[PDB]
Amino acid sequence: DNYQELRVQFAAQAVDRNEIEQWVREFAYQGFDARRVIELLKQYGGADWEKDAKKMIVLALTRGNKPRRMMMKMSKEGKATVEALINKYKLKEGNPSRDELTLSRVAAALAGWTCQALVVLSEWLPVTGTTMDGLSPAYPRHMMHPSFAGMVDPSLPGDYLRAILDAHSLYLLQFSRVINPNLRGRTKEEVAATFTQPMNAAVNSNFISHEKRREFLKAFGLVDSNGKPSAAVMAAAQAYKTAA
Amino acid sequence: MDNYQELRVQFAAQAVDRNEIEQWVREFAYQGFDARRVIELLKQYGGADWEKDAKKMIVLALTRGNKPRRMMMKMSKEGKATVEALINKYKLKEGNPSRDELTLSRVAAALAGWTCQALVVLSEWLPVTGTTMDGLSPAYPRHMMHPSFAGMVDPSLPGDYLRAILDAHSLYLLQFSRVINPNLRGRTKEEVAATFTQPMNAAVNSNFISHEKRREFLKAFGLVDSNGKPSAAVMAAAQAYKTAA
Amino acid sequence: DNYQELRVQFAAQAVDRNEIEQWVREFAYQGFDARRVIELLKQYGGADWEKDAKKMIVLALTRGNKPRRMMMKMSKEGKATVEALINKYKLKEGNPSRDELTLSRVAAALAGWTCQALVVLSEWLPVTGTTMDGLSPAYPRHMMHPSFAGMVDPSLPGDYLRAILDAHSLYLLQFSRVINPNLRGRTKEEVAATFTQPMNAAVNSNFISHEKRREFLKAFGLVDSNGKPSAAVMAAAQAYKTAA
Amino acid sequence: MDNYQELRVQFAAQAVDRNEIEQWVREFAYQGFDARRVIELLKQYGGADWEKDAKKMIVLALTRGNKPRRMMMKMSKEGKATVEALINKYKLKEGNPSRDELTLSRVAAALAGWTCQALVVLSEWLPVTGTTMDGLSPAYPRHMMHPSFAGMVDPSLPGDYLRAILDAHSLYLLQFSRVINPNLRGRTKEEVAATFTQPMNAAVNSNFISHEKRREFLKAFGLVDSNGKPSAAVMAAAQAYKTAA
Amino acid sequence: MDNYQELRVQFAAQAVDRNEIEQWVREFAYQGFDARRVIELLKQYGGADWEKDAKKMIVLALTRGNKPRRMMMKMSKEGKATVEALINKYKLKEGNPSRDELTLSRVAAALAGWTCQALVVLSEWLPVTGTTMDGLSPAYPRHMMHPSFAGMVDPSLPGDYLRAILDAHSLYLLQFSRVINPNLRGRTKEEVAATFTQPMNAAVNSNFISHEKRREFLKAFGLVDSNGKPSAAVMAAAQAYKTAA
Amino acid sequence: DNYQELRVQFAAQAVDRNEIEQWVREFAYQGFDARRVIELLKQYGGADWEKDAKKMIVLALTRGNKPRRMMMKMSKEGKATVEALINKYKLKEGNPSRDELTLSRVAAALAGWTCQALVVLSEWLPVTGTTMDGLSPAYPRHMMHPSFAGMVDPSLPGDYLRAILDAHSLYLLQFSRVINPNLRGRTKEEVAATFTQPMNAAVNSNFISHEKRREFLKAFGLVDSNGKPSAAVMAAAQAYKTAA
Ligand SMILES: O=N[O-]
Ligand SMILES: O=N[O-]
Ligand SMILES: O=N[O-]
Ligand SMILES: O=N[O-]
Ligand SMILES: O=N[O-]
Ligand SMILES: O=N[O-]
Ligand code: NA
Ligand code: NA
Ligand code: NA
Ligand code: NA
Ligand code: NA
Ligand code: NA
């Protein structure tokens, strides 16, 4: 048994690009499992799942991702509603197994609705639309949640895709610093290192086709019928370039 | 079949109803305290004695704070006995307990109409005195000198008038928050504001005391005129908050 | 049961200034209970209480307020005397109940004698008279303990009262910083925030009448027969104004 | 008698044999991992499946890191199942365990000849990308972009050529060590170098893969010519490391 | 009746007797050690061997310190055995125990008349050497180079002469306190002085060894003349302490 | 029993310089017991002790003084050798009793060989000869371990002795800072305060006579036949003078 010979023979094995890249995708970072999230919503929720999901998205966007914590500072009626949601959907916090629901996961799996809701919810978010407008004129409300990444069509022409992601990153920079106060004294590049992984995971996920995602981007007014980013997106992308 | 992509796209096609969503926002919003429950508990525990006891507890809250066991350690024998009896009768707690528990601060907040009037008498015995406030803004409104005041604000006031009322009140909240907490020593105005704006806005926007009755109190307190326009003293304090550090 | 109506009716209740101010006084900060202190001294001490109290005042002023701690660095004779005092008077430390004695409480309750003793004890105090003299010429020794606050007549004309308290505060500023080393890097205003509460409590307490307190101030040479502060008091008040 | 001074002086008179002492130095030198044991364990646990599984584990090491339980917490259901099976079959551990335990990093290191080739494909999915490296030194050699590369270095190369190869590799190691560890934020080049030079030199000088076969890999990778002279890209990267901060 | 105000005012009318109060001050003053008890314990434990053992313990205190168990860990077999026997015989402890316990430092302090003389021989083996002291003040008095020296000071010396003696001694205490404690690194002269002045003054003012016998030692040590006037070397060291940092 | 009289009579006792200085030496700091180290080596090692000691010195100089720690990062063969050494010689770490061996103690007790080995081992030491050469030209390799102190003849003329010790201290300054990283931000004088005690202990120990130590210094080329330090020693001494 010549271990040195086994080693050199191993090195002589093909470097199969197709095979290796498939493994990369198989082992890639995944933030959440959209198909499982919806399956669980339908399972626990039955006939009530759609309305309950909408409530859970409003909760995620205006109060956060800790159901037991938010209950401590809430009206009697609101607390009762959340209590019932926890018991019905077995809601957890943070990053449990894929067989468990969280408020943030509901928002992410149903991003088409979430992003639209941001238009309505703007002034009740941790970073408001008004604040974003100070950084870039008419900042797109549809981009104002990490859930937006799942609406991005990665097959857009490179320059258009980059503009969409840079624009969205301007929000992510502000949002990350509000949610995690310890990121306030860190550079843009350092903060980006913390939000790019989940962003790219959703951009490149197998959930919602390229064509359907671009349809959402067009419906949201983020790109025109030719896929070119809106003036507001271009402004925000430029603002990200010079952001600190 | 179980087409989750299809279910997701049809979910996205459903109405994003502004009126419906805004109702949910209100249902799920931050609540600092439950005024109706506070008064219910006062009446329950206090019976015929609740009104007088509530006034005592407000004076206690405004001059000694929100820690009944702590304040008893530095008090006259007679005062200590009064507070001891109040704790046992009303089951008083410290800080922020459940909705089913009373605290001194919650009594003051639930009964803000009286609390804000009492501030006129109590000015020189508050943690931040009226005299101190006067150095920051001339003739500072005494009615604004407790977090309880937020529950007297009418959120339907014209944007500029509402902003002035809140900015003026925030001048006090800035000083008060720094005095009661030596821990919040070297932080900026905005960092201190982050500690008081959430409970402030919750009381401003709560369903307790109608918009009209709130404005009536503001008028009675001399903080706004018949049209809701803030007084000279309020405007002065709002400007002082803008330039405050 | 209309809770909103109950609330507005409550607001319509009179704001009785006399009633409210009486409550303020009833609930006011009290540092110690002078009447109880003397009662306990007489009870535990019997025929020996007066002499023992004098010893306890010397202990409080030259060693501090921790009887068990000071015993660890004391002559055999001194240790035995303190041991006996602890056992006889059940002496405690810090802020126990009003039914318990401490060395500092004895000094405070019997401030008339304590303040006179300071003349003799000056160079053995944590802040010496010599040190005080560097800050203000001929600093009044009678003011050199927190116990002095109980000798202040709050009915003195405002300017005279202010001068007395400012003069006393010059000492309190130095003393607080010696006893609590963490106050050394804090501003005068910040240090004042820590000594003004117990000071004012004693100034405004119901123990020893206005007339009798002013008699002490006159006997100590701190005010003249017309209540006007001495030159030394005025000097110290001015020194406090410009102190850091 | 028991003359310890005499025994000590006669000990000092004994040979200080350079060849003997240098052999002891080698015997007792730092070892980061045991390549022969790694391959033995792979063959033992894997059987007919070991080669394909090893390739998977190398891709896993290079794109997700050295913590199999941690990476599983953010992975597809299918990916998680593959990794779970790999852990159970090969008894995978994290960090630096005993010689009798496999880790993902050890698989990559023991099979560096293949690992370094895979880096050409994997460039844009590594913690520090090839594109990032190109900004620091133009056309940075992809084959050098893993600590595994140290095991491909022939220590018998002429002094200047060896130094260039190692300096060029160290440019990557500087960036890589800072990226994977936010803990090593505000430290200098030399302080970061202190964390990677020991395992680097151990692999460079190890008895695994002959000097001649190592140089053959370097030649095949286009890093040196037929005489062992480093490529233009290697020289550029060596210079970049000199002036790096 | 129980008129506590009356009792308090009549208490204030009682004599504030300077002589009586000053006696109490002395009774209750800080005591660092009890010299009479130290010598009693030495005689008790040591019997016929106490004098020689005391000298050994003083040499031990001055050259190794006040931790007998610690010093044994870095000592010859013979030295260790001597110290071990001394610990068992005299029940030696570290730091500051009760009056009924001996320490090495207490032996040196209780027998300061001999300790200060031994410093002349021991100069170059102390934590701060005489040579080091000479760089700060020329011909620094060796007799002053231990805290034990404080017990040789006559507090009845004229104010200026006493101050000079203590200032000169304090120059050593400043250096000594900083050397034996790496913990007291970045503190000022006054902050270091706060750590040594209390035990210094206690020994200066203690009832052990008469004022006259203390001055006799000072004269014998060449530190003062027949009139109590400090030597040139003492004056030089006093001036050095004034300008020291 | 007059304790004051006993005290003054004690002071009247002779200050015997011979007696006192003998006690100083008896109680002096000792880093290790060379005679005991060799006795233990011979006892545990029997016929193998000399070869094993050489291995242990190479271990001490190239890996350090923690046998169980170094084993964790070592070849299978090397680990087995060290394991056997630990079991045979009952090797410990740090500062155990004199009846226990450590790797550093073997190197120190057999310094004559250790110092020669440094010539061979230079580039594998924590501070290399190459590094030392940057500070002082042709730095003497024989000085590059704390073990060297036991080769120093304290009877050398003062200037020659000082030059030897200053030269050796240049290495000790660099070495101490590498082994103890917390000494990096400390002054030369502060670092010296940590290495001078063990240095002087070995310089002045009763192990290996003055004549034999000087013979080693001459054989190592550190002094000439007249005891005068080499040019390299003088260079290093000067480098220590101006070192930070
Ligand atoms: O991790 N986003 O599918
Ligand atoms: O928390 N104010 O309703
Ligand atoms: O608290 N002084 O009565
Ligand atoms: O640790 N590389 O053999
Ligand atoms: O503490 N000296 O008596
Ligand atoms: O401590 N050296 O013998
Ligand atoms: Na998404
Ligand atoms: Na309302
Ligand atoms: Na008093
Ligand atoms: Na090899
Ligand atoms: Na005396
Ligand atoms: Na040695």
Author numbering:
A (entry chain B), C (entry chain B), F (entry chain B): 2 to 245
B (entry chain A), D (entry chain A), E (entry chain A): 1 to 245
Give the authors' words.
The N protein is the most abundant viral protein in the Phlebovirus virion and plays a key role in encasing vRNA in a protective coat. Here, we present the crystal structure of RVFV N forming a hexameric ring. In conclusion, the structure of the hexamer formed by the RVFV N protein presented here shows that oligomerization is mediated by a flexible N-terminal arm, which binds a hydrophobic pocket in the adjacent subunit.
Using the N2 fraction, crystals were obtained in the P6 space group with unit cell parameters of a = b = 180.9 Å and c = 47.4 Å. *Values in parentheses give the values in the highest resolution shell (1.69–1.6 Å ). The six copies of subunit α that surround the crystallographic 6-fold symmetry axis (black dot) form one hexamer (labeled I), and the three βγ dimers that surround the crystallographic 3-fold symmetry axis (grey dot) form a second hexamer (labeled II). Hexamers I and II in the crystals of the native protein superimpose very well, but the two rings in the crystals of the selenomethionyl protein are slightly different. We have determined the crystal structure of RVFV N in a hexameric form, which shows largely the same fold that was previously seen in a crystal structure of monomeric N. The two structures differ, however, in the position of the N-terminal arm. In the previous structure, the N-terminal arm packs closely against the core domain, while it extends away from it in our structure. Extension of the N-terminal arm is crucial for the oligomerization of N, as it mediates the interaction with the adjacent subunit in the crystallographic hexamer. (D) Docking of the crystal structure of hexamer I formed by native N into the EM density map of the hexameric N-RNA complex.
